[PDB]
Amino acid sequence: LELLSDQGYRVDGRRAGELRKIQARMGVFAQADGSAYIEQGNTKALAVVYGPHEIRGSRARALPDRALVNCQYSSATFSTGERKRRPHGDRKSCEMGLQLRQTFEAAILTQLHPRSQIDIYVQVLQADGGTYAACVNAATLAVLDAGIPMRDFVCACSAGFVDGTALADLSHVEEAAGGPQLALALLPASGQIALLEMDARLHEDHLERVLEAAAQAARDVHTLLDRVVRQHVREASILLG
Amino acid sequence: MLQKREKVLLLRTFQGRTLRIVREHYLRPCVPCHSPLCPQPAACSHDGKLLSSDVTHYVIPDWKVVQDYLEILEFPELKGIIFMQTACQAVQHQRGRRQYNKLRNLLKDARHDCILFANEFQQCCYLPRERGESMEKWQTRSIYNAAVWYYHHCQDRMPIVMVTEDEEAIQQYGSETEGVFVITFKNYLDNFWPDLKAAHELCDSILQSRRERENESQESHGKEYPEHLPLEVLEAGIKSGRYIQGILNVNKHRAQIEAFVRLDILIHGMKARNRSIHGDVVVVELLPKNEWKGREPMPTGRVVGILQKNWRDYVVTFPSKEEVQSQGKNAQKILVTPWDYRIPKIRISTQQAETLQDFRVVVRIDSWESTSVYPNGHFVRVLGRIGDLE
Amino acid sequence: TLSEAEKVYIVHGVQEDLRVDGRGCEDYRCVEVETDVVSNTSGSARVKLGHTDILVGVKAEMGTPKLEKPNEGYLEFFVDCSASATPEFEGRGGDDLGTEIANTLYRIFNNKSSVDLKTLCISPREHCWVLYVDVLLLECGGNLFDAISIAVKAALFNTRIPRVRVLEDEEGSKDIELSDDPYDCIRLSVENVPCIVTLCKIGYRHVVDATLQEEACSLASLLVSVTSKGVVTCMRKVGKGSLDPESIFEMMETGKRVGKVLHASLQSVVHKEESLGPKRQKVGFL
Amino acid sequence: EPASLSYLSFEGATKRNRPNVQVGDLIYGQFVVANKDMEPEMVCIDSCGRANGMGVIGQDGLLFKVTLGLIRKLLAPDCEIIQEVGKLHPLEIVFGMNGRIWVKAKTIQQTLILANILEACEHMTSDQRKQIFSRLAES
Amino acid sequence: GDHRRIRGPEESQPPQLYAADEEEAPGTRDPTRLRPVYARAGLLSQAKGSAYLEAGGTKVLCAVSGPRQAAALRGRLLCDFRRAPFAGRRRRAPPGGCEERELALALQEALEPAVRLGRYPRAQLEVSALLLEDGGSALAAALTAAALALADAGVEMYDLVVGCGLSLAPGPAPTWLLDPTRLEEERAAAGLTVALMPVLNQVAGLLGSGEGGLTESWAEAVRLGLEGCQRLYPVLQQSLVRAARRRGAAA
Amino acid sequence: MAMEMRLPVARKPLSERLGRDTKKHLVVPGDTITTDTGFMRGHGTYMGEEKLIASVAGSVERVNKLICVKALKTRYIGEVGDIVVGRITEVQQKRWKVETNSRLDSVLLLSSMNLPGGELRRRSAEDELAMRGFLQEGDLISAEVQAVFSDGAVSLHTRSLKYGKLGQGVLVQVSPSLVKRQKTHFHDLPCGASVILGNNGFIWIYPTPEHKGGFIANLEPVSLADREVISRLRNCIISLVTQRMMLYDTSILYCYEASLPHQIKDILKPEIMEEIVMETRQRLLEQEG
Amino acid sequence: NIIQEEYQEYRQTKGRSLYTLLEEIRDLALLDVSN
Amino acid sequence: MKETPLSNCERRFLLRAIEEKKRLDGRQTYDYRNIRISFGTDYGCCIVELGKTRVLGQVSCELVSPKLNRATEGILFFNLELSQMAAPAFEPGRQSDLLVKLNRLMERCLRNSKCIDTESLCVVAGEKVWQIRVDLHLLNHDGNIIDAASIAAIVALCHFRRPDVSVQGDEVTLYTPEERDPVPLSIHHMPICVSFAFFQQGTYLLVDPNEREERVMDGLLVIAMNKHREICTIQSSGGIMLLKDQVLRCSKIAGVKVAEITELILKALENDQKVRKEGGKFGFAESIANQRITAFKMEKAPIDTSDVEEKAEEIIAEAEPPSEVVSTPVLWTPGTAQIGEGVENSWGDLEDS
């Protein structure tokens, strides 16, 4: 099957260094302390956060120096072509909630809420392509909506490598083809990387170009989400006064 | 810039499971048209293979004229060809890999006037299906609209000639845009290119072999081999005395025709050989002397079932590079060539074909299936290297 | 929880046909039902009765008939309880509520005339259609039973069930062949799908569509399952206090009348949404 | 079980001039109640009341752990281990009967070497072995 | 499979699905009759309170544990329903089942309106019920027995709980029946079980689902269920009397 | 009775219904705020390398050396001498625990409480047994913050006559940023009811105490003419709080009068709020202006 | 070229190293010089 | 119970060291703690010791039916495990957020690299195929569990030897080491993990850290890369915030280290095969150091089995025979019978009525 034509067009019609269309939203729910909604291409995510509160259970599991970040991951049973129902014991959810907890224990400026918990929930309504970056961006928007201070605006994007060229924002068809996939979590102002992942084989000479293309695609996600945040804050500033 | 749309699909897996997979599609403003009269260079900049305007016309098959008549469109006298990507996609998803590789070599060549057009990635030539349809009608509609768009982008200067083998496209489409015709192929040739009479005999050849084509393809239905049956039948058919049974061998100069049944019964044909290999014990009826053949009329037979079932474990080879890079790069199915002329080719599924093209390997056989012309197998173990005595 | 004085004020108000919102002893807050929200599924709904939020999905798949009857299909429910609804719903903890709702839905739909079962069988003893109803709790704001029993009738009305004409003959292609048409489907005749009616009891008066505060002041409640025609399917009493025989008879009439109005108005609203088709766009979660 | 100090157990400590003791610091002190009926309790100055080196110790050294045998062997009146080991590298030690030792050499390299080579002195019997061993490590 | 039990065959199809004897015909009866019932209280010796209820083909054993450590200002009432695997037509998975959890909740939401938990602060009561044989209405036996056990365990209650059961005939003129059996329950269309307090005259629990859709049959099903719970009371009246007469005289 | 079931309507963005341009300075996390020679960081910002970097979305507010960012959604932060309303969630041996929409729990010490008797008789350990009896779980109080602890905790006291356990009424919880700072948070609105504007976002509405601490129960029925006033104020408060409105005495009084023409039951529609909030907006415009 | 540049940089330490000696010390402390 | 806490003097000393570029145990920055492998007697069993860590690897195969789809391959389980004896903290169900990241690292490396040849492990299709099952256990925790676990899994998989079968026509047969010789496996490449630790916000790094150095570090970087020059997984984790030159430097370092480790592994497997083929003695027993105080060996011993008959005989003869009061069973009514002291009446009746 052709994943890159001779003309340079992909299966869905975009070039190598081209992203899908994103359409976000802030303030979806009312009861919670924060909310967000993003649809990156054909993947629909959702995130809900709860502000610093009293530790549930009160089983002396607190930290006297910082706060306790608690991230979960879930997925709807109609999120793909087949039903594929799973119980709440899978290790895919555990590893996704652990990479989420790892990146948000580094992005959030947590040394201001001693002996407090932060509960972050992510719900995926339709998965087609990169799920990690869609969850990270939806929870970055939900955290901004909740007013929790943070060092920067963390954004994530993936990449690939086919026929000696570097792709960007891979889809499920391209992902399920046995290629060197790769994902980041970038802080645009400093250029630092919060998380790095990889699978499948790849030569050592092509790591610089796949990593550079992924970082550039994350910097391209940054501008599009930045205009959404600026329009939202100008909206509320106009409403307030 | 781009404009998202969707495409549903109905994929049928090998186990009988269909699914409504949904997928993406991204339109663009400016699809390059690879022409020397595009009235704005920069917007695409035409960075590829580019025609030179000397021709009288331009002919675009709709989908079929390149599906089967392709063997015509190689003659270096033909000039001014443009392929609609929807036809290329049709042939790829309908004609396997050989025709597609020939077409793509044709395209990827600086000898002819062949280019390719992104009909489906251009923002006003794409059209969605409607209530009551078929791939053929949607196909011709899309090709037509693509033609019209290419014409109007050309500023009505170079006369496009849409060739079809559809008659109803002739009867309706070809009468409502001045400067573009929907004519049959032989009319195209006659009307334009007389001194190409060579193409005329080959086109008449393939059209008479076409009237055949439907007759041979509809006198074949949906069965390839006589289906087998139980053993107690063969017990009886032996005892009652209407079934002999012996060993079976094959010639090796002629190994698709000359199969013998050592009591010698001449088996002629694959459809007569009925999915069976040498060294086997098969039960066979006789046949009437009015349908016997020559090497006098000899007692040819008919095999319905195999009592006792003798296999072996062969030594085969892998195809060649320039025909693997086209298999994809994750090519599940593959074809293997045995080492003695007496054995058919075997269908197996592996994922290392691009790094074992200098080694002998070993395979086996699990099941001969009739919806395939070949028997199935599975890799077994590696062997030595082609070139060294070992 | 709420203090004793607040509970006294609320119970006194209900007896005077006044409530903190301002409605009466029988008023019903509006809802924002919608359909065709999810892509990958074969039918969707989204019911918003207030602070609550529901989202369901129905997918029809190939399957095998059960042993007791060969000319039938079956229905599969799975009431998920997402952890975004409440922090106390983290991981384990939403299992008992989800099982309670799934069992209630099974009791509701466990009847021969629920929708149909002949239509979902194609070849006896060999094949059948299966339906997966997947409820997803997004928020909890009281009256959770009815906000789901409405989104189920709504989503069931929007099914597709793509038609298959494959011949079962052995000589022919027994393997399931579809119609190859991406837009060829069939409706489901959901006219008489039942719905749940809740009746909280405060003082000696019964109240429909009680809020969380009005639910915390109640001791018992009754559930009635009524179709559009006005017939009862399931009847379960839930609570922590006695109810008395009389209140059963005087709650049954209110269940009948509210059910009839709910069904007629739901038929009208779905027909209004359907009268104009691909126009009007679709808006949800954005 | 963990032990238990008191804020006034230190030298010259009252309700106002409490001592600065953080979480995660090492203290030199002796026990006064160690029966198997309660959590052990230790005071930290003296019998009379003048803290003789007790209290919080350790600012630029390394704390490692050894078995009870080496501690028993070193705390002997006929033990020449410390004198010969200190001949090579000048040192100062504060032993602990729970199996812990605090060392402070001049160079960090020397503190690493003393830390590694002291855990092995319970074994590797003296004479035929210890002098040659000392010469090899002299370097 | 399970690492805390003895593993046997992975799959096992019972011979009922291969049983070549066709389903028989139940028969007919008078719908104004009750199966004779024998009740015994104070059975177990190591339990604070116990009772054994048997009527026709039903055998259920219930035991009550005393208050233990751990809406406070009030005590909890834990419940646990479990039936023996060698009960019914087929075997059942030991780990559990959704039906058992449904009957456990139908027990908890029916025995709390009787006991007064405002006398056991920070304490809790645990009730365990076991069904040795399923030969008819089961939830009409897990309520009577678990209520007899509580009264015999010396806990303070407002009143007892007496249960009943009904089923609907499948004929063209359906009629509700009292105390159905498995031959009259697997051929039925709907069933109803009521929990009536005989003295306070207050319904404690209600449960019913099926094919009966006219709101004039359920009025009769409810009120004949109440007449059944008013007719089962005297036997339970003499059972606790005999239980206390024997328990007291042993001192 | 008709059980209206409407359909969702697309939201109109940009707040084009009136039209205004902001003259403020707006930032988002990661933006570099003014980086002059010497400045002091406020709440909402942090420092990197010779840079004042905003850490939360909002608008910068400076008073003469101080760069800080004011977010538009936060939780309550305690300050000395601030009127709060809370609920008891834990009763301990020597304290209660009160939830007031803060990052932690708030502690009400037994030493600061107007115990029953309301005078100087005695205070000893005999009261400790019955202290956990009257201020039980889930009660409502209204106290004043005393001091700030070392980990953001707040201690609140009830050493007055207007503070103590509350009685009947309704409670409305909103975000703690729509309440305008004033000097009198206790009000006696001339409508038939009263109100307490808790600085933490808790709004308590109760009837006027007829003539003239939880000592009085007064668990007797409340007249019909009082409930309709409480329901009207409840709905009007919801209406103003929803779109933008900051809550205080004049806005609620203005909206209450504007709500007389039509019924209390029918005001739940998206448009009736708009036609009431705009009328209150113009009444404030024609009064202040 | 580059393979030998980083060769001389990131080798295992050559020969007589401290780690060698301290492991010698460990296995000479647990030895047995009487059999 | 929990693990001893970390003081505030060791942290200062370790960081002063790291600043000064000198480590506790003497080894410089780009070094490993030397390795020592030992082979069992039956194939696919080894004990690797990196520094003072121990891992036990054991491979084992079995013949099953190959699911549905993928009818011409075999499956490959894995199961890491942490033994309660490895360290105080490890508790059977209280360390569930290290097991996951470890199993994942191991599985992504070993199963996505495609080094094992699961193509040629079929006998028929749709019918019985071999199901291998790797198993690792941690015995002693001293830091860098994953390098040791990876080397252990590699050696255990490169030392296994399957059973072997005859297939011709449509008929099966299963041999045994005396009927037919066990057969090796096919291993494409050798994916070997490497770990890096970062200290005080990426300013310094240290290769192959042990357990104290693991508690004074910010975050960890792992780079799994088979022989030649081909990377197979990377997973940044911990608390780190990285640059772009550093990933490349790390990749170089991992290249070098995997080269050296594969050298060592190949040499050790070769030596082991030579020993097994010469005809000498092998196994866990003939590996115990004899030059050491804590080892002792004892050859066989007949003890004296000359007396047991007499003692048993006299014991049987010298004790009291079974007595002869025989009890009677009582019959009440078919179905129930009682034995013992019995009950006075036949059965109770109208006792209280």
Residue H315 falls inside a structural domain: no
Question: In total, how many domains does chain H have?
Answer: 1
CA-wise closest residue to B362 among H252, H122, H107: H122
Q: Is residue H346 part of a domain?
A: no
For residues F130 and F26, state if they share a domain.
no
Residue F1: list chain C partners with CB under 8 A.
26-28, 261
Binding partners of A (≥3 Cβ pairs within 8 A): B, C, F, H
CB pair distance less than 8 Å for H25 and G30: no
Chain A interface test: which of F12, F16, F22 (most A C-beta within 10 Å): F22
Name the F residues in 28-57 with CB < 8 Å from any A CB. Answer: 28-30, 44, 46, 53, 55-57
For residue F113, what are its two tokens? Answer: 């409480």
Residue H327 lies in a domain: no
Burial class (CB within 10 angstroms; exposed 0-12, middle 13-18, buried 19+) of H106: buried
Distance CA F111, CA F92 (A): 13
Interface subset of H 9-28, CB within 8 angstroms of D: 9-10, 12-13, 16-17, 20, 22, 24-26
Please name the member of C2, C262, C266 whose beta carbon is closest to the beta carbon of F138.
C2
Q: Which chains touch C (3 or more CB pairs under 8 A)?
A: A, B, E, F
3-state secondary structure of H50: strand
Which residues of chain A make contact with F71, given a CB cutoff of 8 A?
Answer: 147
> Structure solved using which method?
cryo-EM
Question: For H289-293, which contacts have Cβ atoms below 8 Å and span 24 or more sequence positions?
Answer: H291/G31, H291/G32, H292/G30, H292/G31, H292/G32, H293/D123, H293/G30, H293/G31, H293/G32
Of B15, B349, B380, the CB nearest to H120: B380
Calculate the alpha carbon distances from D29 to A152, B116, B383, D46 in Å: 49, 89, 76, 9
F44/A149 Cβ within 8 A: yes
Give the bridge partners for E116, in sequence order: none
Q: In chain C, whose CA is at the least distance from the CA of B133?
A: C181
The CATH number for F44's domain is 2.40.50.100
Question: From the list F26, F75, F105, which residue is nearest A237 (CB)?
Answer: F26
H193 token code pair: 């993990």
Cβ contacts from C onto E, under 8 A: 81
By CB atoms closer than 10 A (0-12, 13-18, 19+), residue A177 is: middle
Asked if the Cβ–Cβ distance from H231 to A197 is below 8 Å, we say: no
* Whether residue F115 is found in the same domain as residue F42: no
Provide the token pair at A77: 């049973």
CB contact under 8 A, C18 and F219: no
Where b means 16+ CB within 10 Å and e means fewer, F105-114 reads bbbbebeebb
Q: What is the 3-state secondary structure (H, E, C) of H165-223?
A: ECCECCECCECCCCCCCCECCCECCCCECCEEEEECCCCEEEECCCHHHHHCCCEEEEE
Q: Please give the residue of chain D at the shortest CA–CA distance from G29.
A: D124
- Chain G residues with CB inside 8 Å of D117's CB? 22, 25
At F220, the amino acid letter reads: E
Strands B114-117 and B81-84: parallel
Strands (E), chain H: 35-39, 45-50, 53-60, 63-64, 76-77, 129-130, 132-140, 195-199, 204-207, 219-226, 230-237, 330-333, 336-338
Nearest CA in chain F to A232: F14
In a domain, F180, yes or no: yes
User: Where do breaks (C to N over 2.5 Å) occur in chain B, by preceding residue number?
Assistant: 263, 295
Residue type for position C172: G
Is residue F107, in this structure, part of any structural domain at all? yes
Which residues of chain A approach chain B closer than 8 Å at the C-beta? 1-2, 6-7, 9, 11-14, 18, 20-21, 41-42, 81-82, 171, 173, 177-178
Chain E touching partners, 3 or more CB pairs below 8 A: C, H
Tokens of E36: 């004779």
Is the residue at F3 inside a domain? no
Could you say which of H25, H292, H293 has the minimum Cβ distance to residue G22?
A: H25
| One domain for residues F189 and F54 | no
Judging contacts by C-beta atoms under 8 Å, the chain B residues touching residue C62 are 17
Q: Does H247 touch chain B (CB under 8 A)?
A: no
What single-letter DSSP state applies at residue H116? B
| H260 in contact with chain G, both atoms CB, cutoff 8 A | yes
The answer to whether domain E1-251 has CATH 3.30.230.70 is yes
List the single residue in B with minimal CA-CA distance to A163.
B329
Please give the span between the terminal C-alpha atoms of chain A, in angstroms, as a whole number: 58
Q: Do chains E and C touch (3 or more CB pairs under 8 A)?
A: yes
> Which range of residues forms the domain containing residue H114?
2-288
Look at residue F163 and tell me if it is in a domain: yes
Instruction: Using DSSP, state whether D32 is helix, strand or coil.
Output: strand
Nearest CA in chain H to E245: H352
Which neighbouring-strand residues pair with F171? F204
- Give the domain CATH number at H165: 3.30.230.70
Contact A208 H248 (CB under 8 A): yes
Window 235-254 of H: residues touching G by CB (8 A cutoff) are 252-253
* Pair F28, F84 in one domain: no
Place of tokens 């810039």: B1
| Closest residue by Cα to residue A186 from A208, A163, A212, A161 | A212
Give the other-Cβ count within 10 Å of E248's Cβ: 8
Rounded distance between C-alpha atoms, residue H293 and residue B250, angstroms: 77
Asked if A21 and B2 come within 8 Å (Cβ–Cβ), the reply is yes
Domain range holding F58? Answer: 19-76
- Within a domain: H211: yes
C232-239 and C220-226 strand pairing: antiparallel
Nearest to B379 among H120, H124, H126 (CB): H120
Total domains in chain F come to: 2
Same domain membership, residue F38 and residue F23: yes
Which residue in H14, F2, B182 sits closest to C257, CA to CA? F2
Is the same domain home to F288 and F147? Answer: yes
Residue B151: closest CA among B193, B180, B119: B180
Residue F12 lies in a domain: no
Instruction: Return the half-sphere exposure (C-beta side, CA atoms, 13 A cut-off) of residue E137.
Output: 27
Least Cα separation, residue F272 to chain C (angstroms): 15
Interface contact B350-H69, CB threshold 8 A? no
Closest Cα in chain G to H22: G18
Q: Which residue of A has its CA nearest to B119?
A: A13
Q: Does E101 touch chain C (CB under 8 A)?
A: yes
Same domain? F42 vs F152: no
**Which chain D residues touch G29 with a CB distance below 8 Å?**
120, 123-124
Query: HSE (CB half, 13 Å, CA atoms) of A177?
Result: 20
Question: Quick one: F38 and F54 in the same domain?
Answer: yes
Find all residues with CB under 8 Å of F67, minimum gap 6, and list them: F33, F34, F39, F40, F41, F42, F45, F52, F60
Interchain touch F–D (≥3 Cβ pairs closer than 8 Å):
no
E231: three-class secondary structure by DSSP: helix
Nearest CA in chain H to G19: H26
**Other chains touching D, judged by 3 or more CB pairs under 8 Å:** G, H
Touch C-D: 3+ C-beta pairs under 8 A: no
Cα separation, E142 vs E130, whole angstroms: 8
Distance CA C48, CA F6 (A): 10
Chain-chain contact of C38 with A29 (C-beta, under 8 angstroms): no
Tokens 């019209």 locate to B148
DSSP for residue F193:
B
Whether residue D32 contacts residue D41, with contact meaning beta carbons closer than 8 Å, is answered with: yes
For helices E217-231 and E233-249, the axis angle rounded to 10 degrees is 30
End-to-end Cα, chain G, rounded Å: 54
Is F258 within the bounds of a domain? yes
Spell out which residues of chain C touch residue F4, defining contact as CB-CB under 8 Å.
30, 265
Cα–Cα dist H260/H255, whole Å: 9
**Domains defined along chain C, listed by start:** 1-286 (3.30.230.70)
Tell me how far apart the alpha carbons of residues H199 and C45 are, in angstroms, rounded to a whole number.
Answer: 54
Would you say residue H297 lies in a domain?
A: no
What distance in Å separates residue H65's CA from the closest CA in chain E?
14
- Judging contact as 3 or more Cβ pairs under 8 Å, the answer for A and F is yes
From the list F26, F30, F104, which residue is nearest A234 (CB)?
F26
Measure CA of the first residue to CA of the last residue in chain D; give whole Å. Answer: 45
**If residue A117 lies in a helix (H) or strand (E), which one and from where to where?**
strand A117-124
Beta bridge partners of C223: C198, C236
- CA F33 remoteness from chain centre: 31
In a domain, F275, yes or no: yes
Task: Answer yes or no: do H231 and A193 touch at CB < 8 A.
Answer: no
CA distance E61 to E79: 14
